[PDB]
Symmetry: C6
Subunit: 73 residues, 6 copies
RNA sequence: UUUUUU
């Protein structure tokens, strides 16, 4: 079910989507996006930026900065 | 069939291609392209920018920003 | 054949067969205009005005051809 | 255990257990100073002054810790 | 040989065997002019005027050789 | 044993560690570090920079420039 | 750690 050693990432990205937490996604190119996590697979993350969809590649993502801290285990 | 854990990206890029949606493609190098998806494999995306083809490597792609939101599941 | 790179293996081959001239945009903003001689999974051999150019795919951003490739 | 991530899995864990303070240099020149909360194969979760920061490893350049880690 | 890095393993080999001098353009704009001593899957060992240079392939952008390499 | 086709890199970094050779490590982001290799696994290199430890990811490293040339085979 | 999450 789970897959070896991306527990932390799949969990974190899941809660942000589930808990509708707002986050600032920092891209590597200095650009940033503020919005909510709609969905994600292994290589991409779908964002909702004010009603608009944003398909972002993980290799372009630098940091996830959430407005609310996510509870861990 | 054949998948892996890359459901979200393969479905999304196909719909953009199927629905002939116009999208703004931001590259990692800051450059951007506005056009429509013709085809894609694992590593490249073929784009139609004003009638002209553009073979873009996914590792150069940062975000897909579509004029129309793509239907999900 | 190898799954999930039909499109790239096809496209780069056509540029090579039909001797299409292309502008190769690198990620670092640099660009090269030339013709595809050969390519394998990680590199592209380019012919830039008689000069050979071995380019790594991770450095390539976009392929912009003078002539569109048949689909 | 997993072949040849001995050094990294040990190092990042010690930073987390001993709560060593570290400056994380990103590839884009930006930096973050904080403590390791958790990490998997692709991400490192940081605590920057009470605020969480999910950082992708491909964006990280260097880990510079306030205290040297015992080997 | 191994799976579809034919072109690269051959080219880097000829440059080393035939001692052709090449300019290596790095991604960060930096460049190095020298000769290929050795290489494995992730690194290239370079000779820049007697000095060794271990370059990671992910940092390499382009190989520009002084002499064109025959092909097959 | 265990290898793959990364012969040249594992041998070289080991000798730098074994021979305690001083090296200038150029990062992709232009930064430099002068120090000695303490240890390395597949993705990271632990450096000794003026007595201080530096965990550097290989993907950030561009070139290893050693004060002494390292013996090969 | 050399072609889309170390």
């Amino acid at each position: 079910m789970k897959q070896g050693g991306q527990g932390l990432q799949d969990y974190y990205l899941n809660q942000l989507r589930k808990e509708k937490i707002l986050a600032t996604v920092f891209l590597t190119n200095g650009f940033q996006l503020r919005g909510r996590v709609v969905s994600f697979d292994n290589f991409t993350v779908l964002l909702d930026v004010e009603g608009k969809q944003q398909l972002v590649f993980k290799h372009a993502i630098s940091t996830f900065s959430p407005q609310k801290n996510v509870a861990l285990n």
